[PDB]
Design a protein around this ligand. Structure first.
Ligand SMILES: CCCCCCCC/C=C/CCCCCCCC(=O)OC[C@H](O)CO
Ligand SMILES: CCCCCCCC/C=C\CCCCCCCC(=O)OC[C@H](O)CO
Ligand SMILES: CCCCCCCC/C=C\CCCCCCCC(=O)OC[C@H](O)CO
Ligand SMILES: CCCCCCCC/C=C\CCCCCCCC(=O)OC[C@H](O)CO
Ligand SMILES: CCCCCCCC/C=C\CCCCCCCC(=O)OC[C@H](O)CO
Ligand SMILES: CCCCCCCC/C=C\CCCCCCCC(=O)OC[C@H](O)CO
Ligand SMILES: CCCCCCCC/C=C\CCCCCCCC(=O)OC[C@H](O)CO
Ligand SMILES: CCCCCCCC/C=C\CCCCCCCC(=O)OC[C@H](O)CO
Ligand SMILES: CCCCCCCC/C=C\CCCCCCCC(=O)OC[C@H](O)CO
Ligand SMILES: CCCCCCCC/C=C\CCCCCCCC(=O)OC[C@H](O)CO
Ligand SMILES: CCCCCCCC/C=C\CCCCCCCC(=O)OC[C@H](O)CO
Ligand SMILES: CCCCCCCC/C=C\CCCCCCCC(=O)OC[C@H](O)CO
Ligand SMILES: CCCCCCCC/C=C\CCCCCCCC(=O)OC[C@H](O)CO
Ligand SMILES: CCCCCCCC/C=C\CCCCCCCC(=O)OC[C@H](O)CO
Ligand SMILES: CCCCCCCC/C=C\CCCCCCCC(=O)OC[C@H](O)CO
Ligand SMILES: CCCCCCCC/C=C\CCCCCCCC(=O)OC[C@H](O)CO
Ligand SMILES: CCCCCCCC/C=C\CCCCCCCC(=O)OC[C@H](O)CO
Ligand SMILES: CCCCCCCC/C=C\CCCCCCCC(=O)OC[C@H](O)CO
Ligand SMILES: CCCCCCCC/C=C\CCCCCCCC(=O)OC[C@H](O)CO
Ligand SMILES: [Cl-]
Ligand SMILES: [Mn+2]
Ligand SMILES: [Mn+2]
Length: 392
């Protein structure tokens, strides 16, 4: 199973930005958002995985083959904007880590990131599998560090428990809450996960399809459960480190290493930036591969990979030339990603409730309703954010 490197999206630089900023600025009051977004992601990623197993096709393929041509065109275009926002936080997050490790300007950090992403693009599994394992080592261990630091930091349990009750903290809190949902419920994974499980069967029977669904549901929840524990711990450690005090540039990724200083000591700066670098490079490489697959499913053709790697790279250089804050752009991209979630959910909820698509593996009616409740929740939360951002 070499497809495990796609699991870095739940630990991409977007999660680092939203977790650290959420704790530093709003303390523990956003823990419930991470728990909600992680539970929503378990349901959605199971439906996506069950769609590929039951139907044998990925979600963009089904839209292309079943829905009218103009609707398929609109769905491919909005899927490309999702890939732009997704790759932006991951590519810029890698460039930021280059600056944290070498002091190199953000422009040259992106130049280095570009050459590296172009090099990984045309590599086979022989030279990539050791890199995938090395990335998984840094990110897992930096996640274990937060799981250990969240206990050693002695957090205020009264504020931690209160943080699991849904509450907003002004206008900027809904903005960051929407960003936390997009950082966990990622639209590009909704399309991609259906493609990772398609064509993965051996005897093409119902009993075998039910077997792959059972194994997937246990594997998804086990990994998603660990990712949620890490994300909550990272926000809790960030809250216990910065919130309530007045630390300069609190929440920014250039100072986030201080969250692990009591545990790692003088090594907290390098190990954080190394984990952020491996996270950004692998997610940006997987994201480029995923966008090529999503376009092929929607349109029947695709642009060459070097051209896609080039187009998705321009906004990162534009943002750097604009002098914008990298951590603030990482959050904004996650916010934009959450506005693409309802578009991905509607065909997922419809297709997995169809017998001519799923066969005997039609989704249970209870989980179809929970999915539509999740979709309505995210549509309502995206609308309230757009309401305050436009005024009133
Ligand atoms: C991140 C969330 C994004 C939310 C906003 C979504 C993207 C907005 C722009 C859409 C392009 C216009 C959509 C229409 C697609 C082209 C016009 C069309 O209808 O297709 C042409 C023809 O009918 C088929 O062959
Ligand atoms: C769980 C679905 C995530 C996406 C697919 C990754 C599969 C990971 C499963 C086992 C990892 C051990 C290596 C096999
Ligand atoms: C523990 C946080 C996740 C819970 C499950 C995700 C659902 C998201 C919204 C729940 C509001 C439930 C209403 C409870 C009262 C909220 C306002 C007081
Ligand atoms: C087992 C390996 C252990 C390696 C542990 C160290 C890792 C250093 C990270 C990148 C190398 C580039 C660092 C050189 C860049 C010079 C600019 C700079 O980082 O300045 C900071 C300091 O004042 C002067 O290094
Ligand atoms: C993990 C990868 C870390 C980096 C290792 C690959 C080195 C980057 C290659 C060319 C640099 C492009 C030009 C260098 C930037 C200008 C420096 C002045
Ligand atoms: C394709 C691989 C990249 C090729 C590089 C391989 C190694 C050369 C390293 C440094 C020199 C790079 C050129 C440095 C010249 C910069 C002059 C300048 O004006 O800097 C402005 C800055 O680029 C904002 O526009
Ligand atoms: C403190 C709990 C409230 C925080 C709310 C955020 C959610 C965090 C989720 C799981 C905690 C991680 C626990 C992982 C256990 C590893 C830590 C540990 O074992 O602590 C050893 C230490 O030496 C003993 O003194
Ligand atoms: C089961 C999975 C294990 C994973 C580990 C998850 C860590 C969660 C630990 C603490 C969260 C909330 C505990 C706080 C209990 C309620 C808050 C409190 O301390 O009481 C204050 C009172 O409610 C106000 O007046
Ligand atoms: C799923 C991903 C796997 C990780 C599991 C998440 C860890 C904790 C889950 C339950 C939250 C426990 C805390 C809730 C009990 C305290 C509470 O209810 O908060 C009210 C507060 O005490 C009034 O002020
Ligand atoms: C091999 C296994 C371990 C490999 C990773 C260990 C950490 C590496 C370097 C620590 C940081 C580099 C040394 C920093 C010295 C700079 C200094 O003197 O202080 C900086 C100060 O914080 C600024 O104001
Ligand atoms: C803004 C819209 C995107 C801009 C449009 C592209 C801009 C040109 C960029 C690089 C040169 C093309 C990449 C060079 C690789 C050529 C690939 C190719 O055709 O292969 C021929 C030959 O084998 C090669 O070695
Ligand atoms: C077919 C045509 C393509 C369809 C296009 C659909 C529109 C793009 C959708 C979401 C992007 C939202 C981006 C919001 C930009 C906010 C920028 C910002 O807030 O930053 C301040 C500004 O950059 C000062 O530097
Ligand atoms: C709210 C934002 C998300 C809205 C999803 C956009 C597609 C909605 C309906 C078309 C799907 C039904 C088409 C089925 C046969 C034609
Ligand atoms: C706050 C809202 C979130 C609530 C969180 C509740 C926890 C549910 C999470 C995972 C269970 C599995 C989800 C759906 C798994 C597939 C269900 C199904 O019907 O699949 C049967 C068929 O065999 C295959 O196609
Ligand atoms: C609000 C929940 C409304 C959605 C309820 C879905 C009912 C269902 O069972 O889905 C099959 C139906 O034909 C839809 O495709
Ligand atoms: C948390 C979600 C609460 C679980 C409640 C199940 C959601 C539901 O309503 O499913 C029942 C439906 O009426 C049967 O078709
Ligand atoms: C600002 C706060 C705004 C608060 C409201 C925001 C959500 C409103 C409408 C969502 C409609 C989404 C679709 C829900 C319709 C239920 C459904 O599932 O109908 C499809 C049918 O089941 C297939 O056959
Ligand atoms: C910016 C692209 C807009 C579409 C993005 C989908 C998210 C839902 C958006 C508004 C909810 C409208 C209904 C609630 C009032
Ligand atoms: C009443 C249900 C039928 C609505 C029809 C949907 C139309 C517009 C959305 C109106 C949203 C309804 C209530 C707004 C709740 C909300 O999410 O927004 C909060 C508001 O912007 C500040 O408090
Ligand atoms: Cl708090
Ligand atoms: Mn993510
Ligand atoms: Mn900054």
């Amino acid at each position: 199973g070499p497809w495990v490197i796609a699991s870095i999206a739940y630990m991409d630089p977007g999660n680092f930005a939203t977790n650290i900023e959420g704790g530093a600025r709003y303390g523990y009051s956003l823990l419930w958002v991470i728990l909600a977004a992680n539970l929503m992601a378990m349901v959605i990623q199971n439906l996506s995985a069950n769609l590929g197993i039951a139907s044998g096709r990925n979600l963009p393929e089904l839209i292309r083959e079943r829905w009218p041509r103009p609707l398929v065109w609109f769905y491919w275009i909005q899927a490309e904007l999702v890939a732009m926002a997704t790759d932006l936080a991951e590519f810029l997050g890698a460039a930021l880590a280059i600056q944290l490790l070498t002091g190199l300007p953000m422009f040259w950090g992106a130049v280095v990131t570009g050459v590296v992403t172009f090099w990984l693009l045309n590599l086979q599994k022989r030279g990539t599998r050791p890199l995938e394992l090395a990335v998984g080592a840094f990110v897992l261990m930096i996640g274990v560090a937060y799981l250990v630091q969240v206990v050693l930091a002695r957090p205020d349990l009264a504020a931690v428990g209160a943080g699991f009750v849904p509450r907003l903290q002004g206008p900027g809190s809904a903005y960051l809450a929407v960003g936390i949902i997009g950082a966990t419920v990622m639209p590009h994974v909704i399309y991609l996960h259906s493609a990772l499980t398609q064509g993965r069967i051996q005897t093409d029977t119902t009993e075998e399809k039910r077997r792959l669904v059972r194994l997937n549901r246990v594997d998804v929840i086990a990994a998603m459960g660990l990712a949620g524990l890490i994300n909550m711990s990272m926000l809790a450690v960030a809250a216990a480190t910065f919130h309530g005090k007045n630390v300069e540039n609190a929440g920014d990724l250039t100072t986030a290493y201080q969250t692990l200083t009591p545990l790692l000591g003088p090594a907290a700066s390098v190990l954080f930036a190394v984990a952020l670098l491996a996270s950004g490079l692998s997610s940006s490489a997987v994201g480029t591969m995923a966008g090529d697959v999503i376009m092929q499913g929607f349109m029947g053709f695709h642009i060459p990979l070097w051209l896609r790697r080039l187009i998705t790279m321009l906004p990162a250089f534009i943002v750097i030339l604009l002098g914008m804050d990298p951590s603030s752009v990482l959050i904004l991209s996650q916010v934009i990603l959450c506005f693409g979630v309802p578009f991905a959910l509607v065909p997922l909820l419809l297709f997995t409730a169809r017998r001519d698509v799923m066969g005997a593996l039609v989704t249970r009616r209870s989980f179809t309703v929970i999915g539509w409740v999740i979709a309505v929740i995210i549509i309502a939360l995206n609308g309230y954010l757009l309401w305050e951002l436009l005024g009133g």
